[PDB]
Design an enzyme around this catalytic site. Sequence first.
Site, PDB file in Angstrom:
ATOM      1  N   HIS A 142     -36.752  35.821  -9.123  1.00  0.00           N
ATOM      2  CA  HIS A 142     -36.672  34.986  -7.672  1.00  0.00           C
ATOM      3  C   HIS A 142     -37.204  33.914  -7.637  1.00  0.00           C
ATOM      4  O   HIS A 142     -36.437  33.051  -7.077  1.00  0.00           O
ATOM      5  CB  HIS A 142     -36.815  36.358  -6.978  1.00  0.00           C
ATOM      6  N   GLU A 143     -38.463  33.804  -7.786  1.00  0.00           N
ATOM      7  CA  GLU A 143     -39.209  32.656  -7.365  1.00  0.00           C
ATOM      8  C   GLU A 143     -38.668  31.399  -8.380  1.00  0.00           C
ATOM      9  O   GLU A 143     -38.625  30.472  -7.739  1.00  0.00           O
ATOM     10  CB  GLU A 143     -40.699  32.694  -7.812  1.00  0.00           C
ATOM     11  N   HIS A 146     -35.418  29.647  -7.191  1.00  0.00           N
ATOM     12  CA  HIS A 146     -35.740  28.818  -6.041  1.00  0.00           C
ATOM     13  C   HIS A 146     -35.817  27.265  -6.439  1.00  0.00           C
ATOM     14  O   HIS A 146     -35.343  26.316  -5.945  1.00  0.00           O
ATOM     15  CB  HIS A 146     -37.186  29.063  -5.067  1.00  0.00           C
ATOM     16  N   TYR A 157     -34.432  25.491   3.739  1.00  0.00           N
ATOM     17  CA  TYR A 157     -34.700  26.792   4.011  1.00  0.00           C
ATOM     18  C   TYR A 157     -35.002  27.246   5.564  1.00  0.00           C
ATOM     19  O   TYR A 157     -35.998  27.464   5.892  1.00  0.00           O
ATOM     20  CB  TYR A 157     -36.204  26.967   3.369  1.00  0.00           C
ATOM     21  N   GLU A 166     -32.154  32.356  -0.316  1.00  0.00           N
ATOM     22  CA  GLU A 166     -32.900  33.774  -0.424  1.00  0.00           C
ATOM     23  C   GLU A 166     -31.964  34.617  -1.418  1.00  0.00           C
ATOM     24  O   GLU A 166     -32.461  35.275  -2.255  1.00  0.00           O
ATOM     25  CB  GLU A 166     -33.619  34.417   0.885  1.00  0.00           C
ATOM     26  N   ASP A 226     -39.336  34.262  10.627  1.00  0.00           N
ATOM     27  CA  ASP A 226     -38.831  34.137   9.138  1.00  0.00           C
ATOM     28  C   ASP A 226     -37.799  32.881   9.081  1.00  0.00           C
ATOM     29  O   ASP A 226     -36.879  33.002   8.311  1.00  0.00           O
ATOM     30  CB  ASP A 226     -38.365  35.461   8.894  1.00  0.00           C
ATOM     31  N   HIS A 231     -35.150  35.827   4.965  1.00  0.00           N
ATOM     32  CA  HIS A 231     -35.067  37.049   4.123  1.00  0.00           C
ATOM     33  C   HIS A 231     -34.371  38.348   4.850  1.00  0.00           C
ATOM     34  O   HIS A 231     -34.329  38.962   3.969  1.00  0.00           O
ATOM     35  CB  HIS A 231     -36.692  37.537   4.154  1.00  0.00           C
TER      36      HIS A 231
HETATM   37 ZN   LIG Z   1     -37.359  33.620  -1.807  1.00  0.00          ZN
END
Ligand SMILES: [Zn+2]
Length: 316
Positions: A142-143, A146, A157, A166, A226, A231
Amino acid sequence: ITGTSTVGVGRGVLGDQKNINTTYSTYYYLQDNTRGNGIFTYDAKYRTTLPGSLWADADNQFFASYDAPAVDAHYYAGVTYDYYKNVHNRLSYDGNNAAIRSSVHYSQGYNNAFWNGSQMVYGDGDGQTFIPLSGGIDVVAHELTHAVTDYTAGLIYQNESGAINEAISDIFGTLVEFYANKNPDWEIGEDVYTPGISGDSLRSMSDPAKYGDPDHYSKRYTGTQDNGGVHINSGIINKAAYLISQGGTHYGVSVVGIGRDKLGKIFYRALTQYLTPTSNFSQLRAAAVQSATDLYGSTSQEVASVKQAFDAVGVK
Ligand SMILES: [Zn+2]
Ligand SMILES: [Ca+2]
Ligand SMILES: [Ca+2]
Ligand SMILES: [Ca+2]
Ligand SMILES: [Ca+2]
């Protein structure tokens, strides 16, 4: 550092043993020279200063409990690189074999992980909400995804484009989990979230509402938390992606699954060919349809399932 490429062995966060690629020059460093310009893993030693020190070890054996997150961050960065190379012909995250760097032991009791613009960073968790975050391959991937998104579509974002950002990381994080193929599921973070509670995860793609995340456009979060719910509202896209792959009936709309490989090919094409920094949910739909058209024809089952799945989550 300059040295001799070699292979070490270590134990990961979950106690499993694996081999890792290291580099030898006086010490054994966590530097893997077999992948692009390299994978480099660093020790931030409980500070927030980055990157910290390139991980050095005296005997090429990484069985200390202090070593475990470094082993996993280093090894799963490897697998993720391989996924992009073997499946989508992409060489590292920038497409030109950029070095992948990760720091672990970041801060103290830090319950997160992130891409900071230049590298991955992994907290150790506080030992009850999380264990060290590099222990979950869906999290690592996941990271790293990005980074991929930043170098291609560059989704901002914030608000809907952030939610897409996301969702793309959860989707490929899950695909990478299925690629490495040990206990794959459609949940996010299940291996490192709440060690004293089984069956749960941070987010669910199969049923986002399980944790209070929307699974239909009409239930989107429109406040300011957020970053406008990046998310939270991702659950709407995650649900669509799940339906596209596995099929099902959702709010009375039926979708025939086309499986994981095709879902990956479609979403990678959308991401690298048609998404822009300010793309919203409705533009994601057009991008995915156009992608599946390019790949399988305007009158394929694939284009029809993509349409079905976005109708199911209320995205026109
Ligand atoms: Zn993320
Ligand atoms: Ca050692
Ligand atoms: Ca799993
Ligand atoms: Ca998972
Ligand atoms: Ca748990």
